[PDB]
Write a protein that holds these residues in place. Sequence first.
Motif, PDB file in Angstrom:
ATOM      1  N   UNK A 166       0.827  -1.202   0.000  1.00  0.00           N
ATOM      2  CA  UNK A 166       0.000   0.000   0.000  1.00  0.00           C
ATOM      3  C   UNK A 166       0.864   1.256   0.000  1.00  0.00           C
ATOM      4  N   UNK A 167       2.100   1.147   0.496  1.00  0.00           N
ATOM      5  CA  UNK A 167       3.027   2.272   0.427  1.00  0.00           C
ATOM      6  C   UNK A 167       3.632   2.405  -0.965  1.00  0.00           C
ATOM      7  N   UNK A 168       3.842   1.280  -1.653  1.00  0.00           N
ATOM      8  CA  UNK A 168       4.509   1.314  -2.950  1.00  0.00           C
ATOM      9  C   UNK A 168       3.562   1.678  -4.087  1.00  0.00           C
ATOM     10  N   UNK A 169       2.247   1.679  -3.842  1.00  0.00           N
ATOM     11  CA  UNK A 169       1.302   2.071  -4.883  1.00  0.00           C
ATOM     12  C   UNK A 169       1.297   3.582  -5.084  1.00  0.00           C
ATOM     13  N   UNK A 170       1.565   4.340  -4.020  1.00  0.00           N
ATOM     14  CA  UNK A 170       1.695   5.786  -4.131  1.00  0.00           C
ATOM     15  C   UNK A 170       3.075   6.218  -4.605  1.00  0.00           C
ATOM     16  N   UNK A 171       4.056   5.315  -4.590  1.00  0.00           N
ATOM     17  CA  UNK A 171       5.396   5.607  -5.076  1.00  0.00           C
ATOM     18  C   UNK A 171       5.621   5.157  -6.512  1.00  0.00           C
ATOM     19  N   UNK A 172       4.813   4.218  -7.009  1.00  0.00           N
ATOM     20  CA  UNK A 172       4.934   3.741  -8.382  1.00  0.00           C
ATOM     21  C   UNK A 172       4.362   4.719  -9.400  1.00  0.00           C
ATOM     22  N   UNK A 173       3.559   5.689  -8.960  1.00  0.00           N
ATOM     23  CA  UNK A 173       3.045   6.714  -9.859  1.00  0.00           C
ATOM     24  C   UNK A 173       4.156   7.679 -10.250  1.00  0.00           C
ATOM     25  N   UNK A 174       4.445   7.736 -11.551  1.00  0.00           N
ATOM     26  CA  UNK A 174       5.538   8.554 -12.062  1.00  0.00           C
ATOM     27  C   UNK A 174       5.210  10.042 -12.053  1.00  0.00           C
ATOM     28  N   UNK A 175       3.931  10.402 -12.117  1.00  0.00           N
ATOM     29  CA  UNK A 175       3.558  11.799 -12.044  1.00  0.00           C
ATOM     30  C   UNK A 175       3.465  12.450 -13.414  1.00  0.00           C
ATOM     31  N   UNK A 176       3.712  13.757 -13.435  1.00  0.00           N
ATOM     32  CA  UNK A 176       3.549  14.578 -14.626  1.00  0.00           C
ATOM     33  C   UNK A 176       4.811  14.674 -15.474  1.00  0.00           C
ATOM     34  N   UNK A 177       5.888  13.992 -15.093  1.00  0.00           N
ATOM     35  CA  UNK A 177       7.134  14.073 -15.846  1.00  0.00           C
ATOM     36  C   UNK A 177       7.408  12.831 -16.684  1.00  0.00           C
TER      37      UNK A 177
END
Lengths: 581, 242
Positions: free
Chosen positions: A61-72
């Motif tokens: 559950x912590x790594x699902x918010x870190x796997x999102x690469x974002x706007x770059x």
Amino acid sequence: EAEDLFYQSSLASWNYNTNITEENVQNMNNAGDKWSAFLKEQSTLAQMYPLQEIQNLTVKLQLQALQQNGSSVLSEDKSKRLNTILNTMSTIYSTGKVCNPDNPQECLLLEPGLNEIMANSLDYNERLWAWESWRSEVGKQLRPLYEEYVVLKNEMARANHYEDYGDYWRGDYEVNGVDGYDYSRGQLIEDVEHTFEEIKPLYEHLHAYVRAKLMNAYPSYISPIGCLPAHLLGDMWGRFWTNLYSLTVPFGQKPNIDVTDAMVDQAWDAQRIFKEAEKFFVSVGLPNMTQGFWENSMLTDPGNVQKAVCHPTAWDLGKGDFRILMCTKVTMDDFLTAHHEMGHIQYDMAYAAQPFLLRNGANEGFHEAVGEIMSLSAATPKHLKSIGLLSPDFQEDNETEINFLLKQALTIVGTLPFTYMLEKWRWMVFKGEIPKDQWMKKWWEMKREIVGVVEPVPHDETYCDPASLFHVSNDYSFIRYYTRTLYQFQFQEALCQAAKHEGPLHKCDISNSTEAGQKLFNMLRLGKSEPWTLALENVVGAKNMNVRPLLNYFEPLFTWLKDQNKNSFVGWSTDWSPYAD
Amino acid sequence: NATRFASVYAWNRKRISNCVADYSVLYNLAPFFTFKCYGVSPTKLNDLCFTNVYADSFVIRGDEVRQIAPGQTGNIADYNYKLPDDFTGCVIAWNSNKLDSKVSGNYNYLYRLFRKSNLKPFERDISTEIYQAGNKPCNGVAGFNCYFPLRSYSFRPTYGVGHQPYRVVVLSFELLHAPATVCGPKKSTNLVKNKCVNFNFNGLKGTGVLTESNKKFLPFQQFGRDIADTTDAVRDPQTLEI
């Protein structure tokens, strides 16, 4: 390392909101680029995560918010372009100058100007220029700006393994990995459509009740059958119907329940506001007050030598630091938002041992829906008589509870078809279901059928009508407000079920009872370590979103709205128009 | 009352041996914020002595004060230090707002949040090792799936109690098979003369009449005996009078 770099950035935003100087605008920037560098030096190192072999649910559950690469994800010129247009679309909303087209020699500004004209104005034509010229002078250049913005965020979502950008706001509600409690990303679409069918007779009786009382103010402007003109809803768009209470008062001879006249003569200050209201939390069974909340927060506006923005928000800074910021005034509505904004800060007090990726709400609307259950339980006559603020023998009949029920009907129930009308529109402009010539024609066609509001002036495709709000012009989520009410009524029902109060839910009170404290505190301390579909079963016992306590809250009102509208017309039509002359 | 403190994983050692501890100006005055412990009470330490006492000086966050307990596990109690189940001593905390902090967060002292294994009590673990819970290594760098638990503090006196700088002095009591050396304070009463009264001295118990003595005495002796093997002189415990 995220407890230091974001903590240096967010304390600069607290220092900017306390002291506005020319050296403090750049203080948010130089401490803010190191968090944005840490947001991208970690996410590029989190792209090759094997999620097929990890069995721990607290880690995944912590790594699902870190796997999102974002706007770059995209190229360098497009990453420059999203940094360019986002500060442009928020500056023209803040510094927008709007005035009358007849006499343009005086033009005022945003916040003291537009706010007073929707409160106590009764004129037809003078209030019509306040709604039309805001959509004809600020929203004209948004249509070259939003057409390239709607193709920008669709390419951000396809490379991060989503369908479109409509699943990006629904990605926070996604629960996966637990058998039996599965929740798809597309399950929120039919859940919103199913929860609206119970409130469709609830809003239609509220639609006929407003128009019947407004016949005396506007005889030759409002039809007995058709829809509402958009410039008389008491707001800029229709989110808060609280300013229409003076025109839709059920009994003017009955006195309103307020302690504004009772707070002045006892010489209360802003220090006595947060001290008596902290006794609501310790009597339930929550832990006590922190000392950094008292000698460091800003409750009083520090003179007229320095400017300070004191909009109500709870500053979740980090590591167990808790701070609030508003200009506390002596009225009834400032005491209720003092109950509301510290309801968020006691939710953040519970998960102090959880890490940084789990120090958030269960969705994007969990942090604000858990704050309003103390604010709904502060304006009840059971709490206000126990603190001694009201009369010791105040009259409470069946006719004075309707006036308290309309204070919770206008600002809570009235935004819920308006939350459905915008979020169905925002889900389908990013999916490509409507073309450019049907981009704005679909907006008032779906407005005329589900909220009963017709625009008095026809708008073409060169104007951008829903981007005059605060959340659309800052690219924020709007699905948090639809489940803000459904979670705050499922919590307020199930908490005082254990407090053994027999009666209606608007007369219920969770204070002087420790049974609702331990039933809440094991749910508040979970955070993002447990999903919302298992945390809802510990309090209300239902894993699905249901509209059962919303029908039982206004059950004296739905009897009275049936009997008053025996002669009136229930519903609306798609035939009446103000410009059809 | 130290000006400089140690880190929470770099616990120093200050011996308390072969001395008398006076808790009438430290515990009875109580300038600290909280005073609570388990095992023994603070009113039991005045008449109880132990062999070897140890202490330290370290400042934690305010949310980490609940992990300092015998038999406790957590983020600090299982990764930084550990209190054993037979912990005899007490734990005293006090806030240190403006003197132990600095501007923009006290970044002088660090703390470890992740360890590769569970640690024993009294471990001075100052290593820079990497906790691993995955499949592939990273060749010893803070990189792909490799935690860096070393990160400094954020103390500043305008903050809340959740990470307020709390100076915690864990005083560890320990009794062994050796005889005791460090014993607490004890009040005394006045002395009367020319009366048949009861005697509760430091090393003599009995009764009799105290008069003046014109006999020779030593500065190290406690009592004297006559030819008939009974006590006829006692030296003052507080002073020296036979």
